[PDB]
């Protein structure tokens, strides 16, 4: 085979989006409303329930780093103190934006300091004719105009969970690819508050004269109003008239504004990707049953594959240089970052553990519970219980 | 082989969708400056189309792709590509079926009434305001007196509880919302678009009365995951046999002609019921088949692995012992 | 059948307007008088939240939605074609009332089997 | 998920900006120390909890079952960092 | 640390309150006269801006606050405030988000 890509990638030198839209993501995500908290849910659900880092073979790794014994797994959560809002944080970008894009930050001594988060919205990549990233080009607003500046692909890093294809770099926004939805949702909802002013309400119409009697002059209508008027009017106010004198009322005109907005709800959330009940939209026969399991079991999948997406780029380019450039560990170890599951209960986790814990470790029962594995290595590694041992210990 | 594929996961997602949508996966090997593997790359599938001789063979992949407001052409070999086909004519057909193309018109049917619809909410969802003017048999209303009238009953400066106070010859009429059942036709287009697609109707926020429970319901979620099972199938042999099994010949010391198995896991498996199994029936199962089934990593010490009655139980016996 | 269905969802599925111009034996109206109609009321302009101003000899009417059972239709299709294929009803994402559950739903899953 | 979001935001800012700076300038403890502020959750079912327990215990330090259920931890270390119930160790110290 | 803050639980409904209606939550330390540790004081969120650099760190907080019908203003260094922002533009933004001013529409329209 060869060492170079032989097949070409779709895209050099243009006619592939701008500044502007990515500024117009930036507006949706801050506008506010109903939108907006569909895609936090959706980045709650993908990386909100936090992380844990595996190192394979880590106690292996065991080195005094500084007068002191750290594995590789200790020194990358003293490196990364709070990956778990990091991963909120570039998990959530990723999912509005086409990337997440950041730079690595070390202190003056040149320890390193932190994964500094670039603003998305403000950086474009420029890439060569295989489709690899080499500079991007950053706009910032100040004062009343814009900078612009470009950086090499070189000390930036930068993380794609939306592609196009499985050489795409550069990446899809899910906001500019489901813009149509969104904008038709967003009508659909000033048509409904429009609608409700004029025809959710009635409203009084009286009419003045006989017909085909004698014409009333708007003068004339001045006085009835200030008679009728709304505003001074009372609960109980009673009406005394001749009979030229009609009261009439524009009814409260139906219409069924709740199917509009389960239409509207069901479309934009079936876009996103969530499920219906995320929106506060009920469905019959799908709140129960394999048809719950299919719909819950699908959402549970669209997360592993974006969590997997996330874990592996973000080891790949931002740990594993980490692990190279700043740290006393050989850089080619299995790491691995997992996120957690979102909608795992620990009840059906305690029940398989009590059909069939007499067949797993003491630390696959502590990985599968949440919980720090045995301290000693041979009651981690036995099959029947901690506790059980103990008593036996004890009995003996 | 673990090794050499790490991200196999995302790899086999990504061909797999590929080869859903598409008629082909495809993509090349690449190496290392070195020589030593380093991954197969997918290629962009819209990008490239298959020659093939007259046993139906694929001969020659020819490639189009988009840079500076043109085309780039090329045509390379079929000897360093691979490809990976789902969707067949014929077990013969090395070229294979798009579902999209194949369902091109429930597609564009669905696309159209839902359109449909949008444009039907807009005009007839909604009461609209009808203010008719002037005697019928009276005098004519020209379209200047119109305007003021227009300007007394705007609906932009109306509120809610504004009221009106008229002589006889001003009519406020509605346009009333008028009724249909765009619930309906949005559940038809899902069921025929979802039966198109080979998905159950549930997959598109439908639900249907009778199907949800029972032997009904045992019937449709069988048929998914039989249809699963054979796209895995497929996928996991050409997989075995055009990516892995190549470079286990040119990049490693083993031999090709093993015995090679990629298993996709199933999506809609329960571990309860795996879990109950295993109650049930674990008294007639090694310790590797209990430990397969349930996900675990077998048994380190082989008696262990391969003994019937738990690892547990052994331990409390030797324990006693 | 299902062509059928199509055809009648698009024409019969969705009201339409129908804005009558003139009096009742009053003054023809002729086709280039409608175009300036068609230009205020199109249905391409119009939003959701418009509002109409008319002299007494403007009407504006609607085409209702017109009933029928399509769902019915598909139902009864569906069963012939699975009947036919051999097939449960249930392959087709059609339902059945009491056939569902008990001896009855063993009786057809035993004949498929 | 939101609330679990929002609790941690403010408990890392809540001990880099006032809690360190007042170890720091106040205390004769290290302020590089690994203080964590947890915020409880509200919606916690005490009897789910018990529940788990129950089936699970077996493979929990008192220390930890303490932790779950809210309360203070053991003062005995070998009690605390035991398997079985302090009520169990007891009970064979007693028979004992 | 228990003992430097007694009233942790009222402090962090306090300060997080703040912090979900406001861009910031906001405040001083405050020692006893012999120079020990008094308090964490929260200030007023409504009284206090942050002025930034060109790296949007926040360098100084401009307060304004009423008295007898008219305002004081003053500035204070960033040195001896804090403040903690839950709502984020981005992981930058040293500044935030209210919640109210961002949902400002949907309250307005629902109270008409
Ligand atoms: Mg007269």
Same mark, same amino acid.
């Given at each position: 085979?060869?060492?170079?890509?032989?097949?070409?990638?779709?895209?050099?030198?243009?006619?592939?989006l701008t500044f502007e839209?990515?500024?117009?993501?930036?507006?949706?995500?801050?506008?506010?409303?109903?939108?907006?908290?569909?895609?936090?849910?959706?980045?709650?659900?993908?990386?909100?329930?936090?992380?844990?880092?595996?190192?394979?073979?880590?106690?292996?790794?065991?080195?005094?780093?500084?007068?002191?014994?750290?594995?590789?797994?200790?020194?990358?959560?003293?490196?990364?103190?709070?990956?778990?809002?990091?991963?909120?944080?570039?998990?959530?970008?990723?999912?509005?934006?086409?990337?997440?894009?950041?730079?690595?930050?070390?202190?003056?001594?040149?320890?390193?300091?932190?994964?500094?988060?670039?603003?998305?919205?403000?950086?474009?990549?420029?890439?060569?004719?295989?489709?690899?990233?080499?500079?991007?080009?950053?706009?910032?607003?100040?004062?009343?105009?814009?900078?612009?500046?470009?950086?090499?692909?070189?000390?930036?890093?930068?993380?794609?969970?939306?592609?196009?294809?499985?050489?795409?770099?550069?990446?899809?926004?899910?906001?500019?690819?489901?813009?149509?939805?969104?904008?038709?949702?967003?009508?659909?909802?000033?048509?409904?508050?429009?609608?409700?002013?004029?025809?959710?309400?009635?409203?009084?119409?009286?009419?003045?004269?006989?017909?085909?009697?004698?014409?009333?002059?708007?003068?004339?209508?001045?006085?009835?109003?200030?008679?009728?008027? +709304?505003?001074?009017? /009372?609960?109980?106010? $009673?009406?005394?008239?001749?009979?030229?004198? @009609?009261? !009439?009322?524009? #009814? =409260?005109?139906?219409?069924?504004?709740?199917?509009?907005?389960?239409?509207?709800?069901?479309?934009?959330?079936?876009?996103?990707?969530?499920?219906?009940?995320?929106?506060?939209?009920?469905?019959?026969?799908?709140?129960?049953?394999?048809?719950?399991?299919?719909?819950?079991?699908?959402?549970?999948?669209?997360?592993?594959?974006?969590?997997?997406?996330?874990?592996?780029?973000?080891?790949?380019?931002?740990?594993?240089?980490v692990v190279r450039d700043?740290?006393?560990?050989?850089?080619?170890?299995?790491?691995?970052?997992?996120?957690?599951?979102?909608?795992?209960?620990?009840?059906?986790?305690?029940?398989?553990?009590?059909?069939?814990?007499?067949?797993?470790?003491?630390?696959?029962?502590?990985?599968?519970?949440?919980? +720090?594995?045995?301290? /000693?290595?041979?009651? $981690?590694?036995?099959?029947?219980?901690?506790? @059980?041992? !103990?008593?036996? #210990? =004890?009995?003996?």
């Open positions: 085979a060869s060492s170079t890509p032989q097949t070409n990638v779709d895209s050099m030198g243009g006619g592939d839209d990515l500024r117009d993501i930036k507006d949706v995500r801050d506008s506010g409303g109903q939108v907006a908290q569909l895609m936090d849910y959706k980045a709650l659900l993908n990386f909100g329930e936090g992380c844990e880092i595996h190192v394979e073979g880590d106690d292996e790794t065991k080195q005094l780093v500084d007068g002191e014994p750290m594995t590789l797994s200790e020194w990358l959560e003293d490196a990364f103190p709070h990956l778990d809002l990091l991963v909120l944080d570039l998990g959530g970008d990723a999912l509005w934006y086409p990337y997440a894009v950041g730079e690595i930050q070390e202190t003056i001594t040149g320890e390193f300091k932190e994964a500094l988060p670039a603003e998305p919205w403000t950086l474009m990549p420029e890439s060569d004719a295989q489709g690899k990233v080499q500079a991007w080009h950053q706009r910032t607003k100040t004062h009343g105009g814009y900078q612009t500046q470009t950086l090499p692909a070189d000390d930036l890093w930068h993380i794609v969970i939306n592609k196009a294809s499985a050489r795409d770099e550069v990446g899809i926004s899910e906001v500019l690819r489901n813009k149509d939805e969104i904008q038709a949702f967003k009508q659909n909802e000033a048509a409904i508050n429009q609608a409700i002013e004029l025809h959710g309400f009635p409203q009084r119409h009286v009419k003045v004269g006989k017909e085909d009697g004698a014409p009333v002059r708007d003068n004339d209508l001045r006085r009835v109003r200030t008679i009728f008027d +709304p505003r001074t009017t /009372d609960a109980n106010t $009673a009406y005394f008239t001749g009979q030229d004198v @009609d009261v !009439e009322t524009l #009814e =409260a005109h139906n219409f069924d504004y709740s199917a509009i907005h389960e239409m509207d709800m069901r479309n934009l959330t079936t876009a996103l990707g969530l499920p219906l009940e995320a929106g506060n939209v009920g469905a019959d026969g799908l709140g129960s049953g394999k048809p719950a399991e299919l719909r819950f079991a699908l959402l549970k999948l669209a997360i592993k594959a974006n969590q997997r997406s996330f874990s592996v780029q973000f080891v790949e380019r931002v740990m594993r240089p700043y740290s006393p560990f050989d850089h080619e170890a299995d790491i691995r970052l997992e996120i957690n599951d979102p909608l795992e209960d620990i009840g059906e986790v305690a029940d398989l553990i009590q059909q069939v814990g007499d067949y797993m470790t003491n630390e696959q029962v502590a990985e599968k519970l949440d919980l +720090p594995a045995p301290e /000693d290595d041979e009651v $981690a590694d036995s099959y029947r219980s901690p506790a @059980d041992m !103990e008593k036996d #210990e =004890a009995g003996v």
